[PDB]
Design an enzyme around this catalytic site. Structure first.
Site, mmCIF file in Angstrom:
data_model
loop_
_atom_site.group_PDB
_atom_site.id
_atom_site.type_symbol
_atom_site.label_atom_id
_atom_site.label_comp_id
_atom_site.label_asym_id
_atom_site.label_seq_id
_atom_site.Cartn_x
_atom_site.Cartn_y
_atom_site.Cartn_z
ATOM 1 N N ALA A 116 -7.281 4.407 -9.048
ATOM 2 C CA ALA A 116 -6.012 3.955 -9.620
ATOM 3 C C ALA A 116 -6.002 2.485 -10.020
ATOM 4 C CB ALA A 116 -4.873 4.228 -8.631
ATOM 5 N N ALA A 154 4.362 -6.945 -3.068
ATOM 6 C CA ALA A 154 4.112 -5.527 -2.879
ATOM 7 C C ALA A 154 2.917 -5.037 -3.682
ATOM 8 C CB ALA A 154 5.357 -4.745 -3.261
ATOM 9 N N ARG A 170 -11.078 -0.365 3.370
ATOM 10 C CA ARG A 170 -11.841 -0.798 2.206
ATOM 11 C C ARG A 170 -12.496 -2.163 2.217
ATOM 12 N NH1 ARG A 170 -9.177 0.281 -3.615
ATOM 13 N NH2 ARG A 170 -11.015 1.214 -4.612
ATOM 14 N N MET A 194 -3.129 -4.454 -2.638
ATOM 15 C CA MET A 194 -3.419 -3.185 -3.307
ATOM 16 C C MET A 194 -4.921 -2.968 -3.168
ATOM 17 S SD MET A 194 -1.912 -0.781 -5.090
ATOM 18 C CE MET A 194 -0.410 -1.542 -5.708
ATOM 19 N N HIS A 239 -1.928 -1.045 3.899
ATOM 20 C CA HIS A 239 -1.193 -1.719 2.841
ATOM 21 C C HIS A 239 0.220 -1.930 3.358
ATOM 22 C CE1 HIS A 239 -0.720 -2.073 -1.803
ATOM 23 N NE2 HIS A 239 0.124 -2.880 -1.189
ATOM 24 N N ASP A 243 -13.469 2.230 -8.791
ATOM 25 C CA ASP A 243 -12.201 2.225 -8.045
ATOM 26 C C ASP A 243 -11.472 3.369 -8.760
ATOM 27 O OD1 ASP A 243 -9.271 1.606 -8.860
ATOM 28 O OD2 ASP A 243 -9.405 0.143 -7.242
ATOM 29 N N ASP A 277 -10.645 -3.168 -9.937
ATOM 30 C CA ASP A 277 -9.570 -3.969 -10.503
ATOM 31 C C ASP A 277 -8.699 -4.746 -9.531
ATOM 32 O OD1 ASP A 277 -8.439 -1.389 -9.764
ATOM 33 O OD2 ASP A 277 -6.606 -2.186 -10.690
ATOM 34 N N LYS A 297 -3.569 3.091 2.275
ATOM 35 C CA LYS A 297 -2.114 3.122 2.217
ATOM 36 C C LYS A 297 -1.357 2.596 3.429
ATOM 37 C CE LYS A 297 -2.117 4.612 -1.856
ATOM 38 N NZ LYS A 297 -1.831 3.640 -2.947
HETATM 39 MG MG LIG Z 1 -6.280 -0.456 -8.467
#
Ligand SMILES: [Mg+2]
Ligand SMILES: [Mg+2]
Lengths: 256, 256
Positions: free
Chosen positions: A10, A41, A156, A45, A52, A8, A182, A49
């Site tokens: 970020a 929020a 994703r 994740m 999201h 992944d 993550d 984007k």
């Molecule tokens: Mg992440």
């Protein structure tokens, strides 16, 4: 087994805590007078984007709160507008939150030694990555390949991005691949892809913490939190949890 | 649960016995005073149409009659000249072989009724599939998605073409998909794809007969002849084997 690992971005390798997008998601909603928690929020994740954003307008509270102010649920116009605001703010500060998380590099260094390929799935757009990659490379970290929700038909939760990595790296059997991530999103993506799903915790988005408050946080507490992030990953598809990339190899080892 | 079925083209859904090429090769060599037969043409099975001429060029008996003619032995020129005076002859006579096999039309409808997305992979190049397909459609057969070795990097033995169907049909686990084929290499593609593999026999290719040595071949012989194909299959990695496309749903059923 194991001929390739897929990271992944970020939250797993770059940007500890996954903070770049955070306040922004909150900002756009606050200008409308909605106000959501740093928690909500950060639930979806992982997704593209725009998705999201769309997901935020769909949670009951938010989606309700909204109705209470505009007397009607959120329109494409709105979300479409909200994304346009997100797109330029995030785009401006995106260079900072980009340095690799303390640890990875050595691990990749090690992984490439045993001849293992490094792929990379992500939530950012192609236009976005362009940035994040240059600087991330400038600070040492250039996975063998990079995929984005643009290269494939869907976001994703779908394995799609993963398949393109496999196709590109050249690894056949889907079960010869480790997927380190993550977020909850990644877990699924890994499981749906039919890969071994490992899920890092410290630095993750799940735990959602910086440093001067993890490295400066009371024992139990933190241990009690890790324990909350760990379960989420497991009870969401994840074959192994880790507290950091150092423990990764050992997991591969055990996949025998 | 079985969500998709990737069907092979020649031999599985069209060109019963897979004779489209067999005639072209026997044809190109005939020209150059080098007579070759149906087995020693069939014999160097599969491969890339180019590297097939190449194979046939090394058949002891062929390399001997060739040198008896041109007094040299085939060269890089001759191969080219041949693979070239191949395609044109194929494009010209390929529609005669894009007629759906008695059985398959009536079966696709039944999967369709169950909501099973139909896909397909192949060896024929886009230049050819476009022709073969166009005819096939015109005759009531048209999978939900198509893919040619050109749509992706490496050719057939790899799982790349299935990973792209899955991605397009929209089916998650590779194992919620059944790959049906008429060849040894066809099985490999499925296993590597990590999806339940099935082999169809009477549609030849590995069998190599037509309706006049099947529809009229003596019992004790046809069978002795079938079993061999069924074995070659089971050996090369297929989960199931069916004498006809009919059983296909009984198998999808057994798999559940
Ligand atoms: Mg992440
Ligand atoms: Mg075939």
């Amino acid at each position: 087994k194991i001929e390739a690992v897929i990271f992944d971005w970020a939250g797993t390798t770059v940007d500890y805590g996954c903070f770049a997008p955070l306040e922004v998601f909150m900002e756009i909603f606050h200008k409308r007078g909605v106000a959501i928690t740093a928690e909500e929020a950060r639930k979806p994740m992982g997704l593209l984007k725009i998705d999201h954003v769309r997901a935020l307008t769909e949670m009951p509270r938010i989606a309700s709160e909204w109705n209470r102010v505009f007397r009607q649920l959120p329109t494409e116009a709105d979300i479409q507008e909200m994304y346009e605001e997100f797109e330029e703010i995030l785009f401006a500060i995106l260079p900072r939150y980009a340095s690799p998380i303390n640890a990875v590099k050595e691990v990749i260094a090690s992984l490439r030694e045993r001849g293992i390929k490094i792929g990379s799935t992500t939530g950012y757009t192609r236009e976005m990555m362009d940035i994040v990659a240059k600087e991330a490379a400038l600070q040492g970290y250039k996975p063998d390949f990079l995929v984005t929700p643009d290269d494939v038909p869907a976001g994703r939760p779908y394995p799609w991005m993963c398949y393109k990595n496999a196709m590109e790296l050249g690894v056949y059997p889907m079960n010869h691949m480790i997927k380190v991530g993550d977020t909850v999103s990644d877990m699924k993506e890994g499981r749906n892809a039919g890969m071994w799903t490992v899920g890092v915790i410290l630095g993750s988005s799940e735990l959602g913490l910086t440093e001067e408050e993890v490295e400066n946080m009371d024992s139990v507490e933190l241990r009690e939190k890790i324990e909350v992030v760990r379960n989420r990953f497991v009870e969401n598809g994840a074959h192994f949890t880790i507290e950091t990339m150092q423990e990764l190899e050992s997991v591969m080892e055990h996949i025998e």
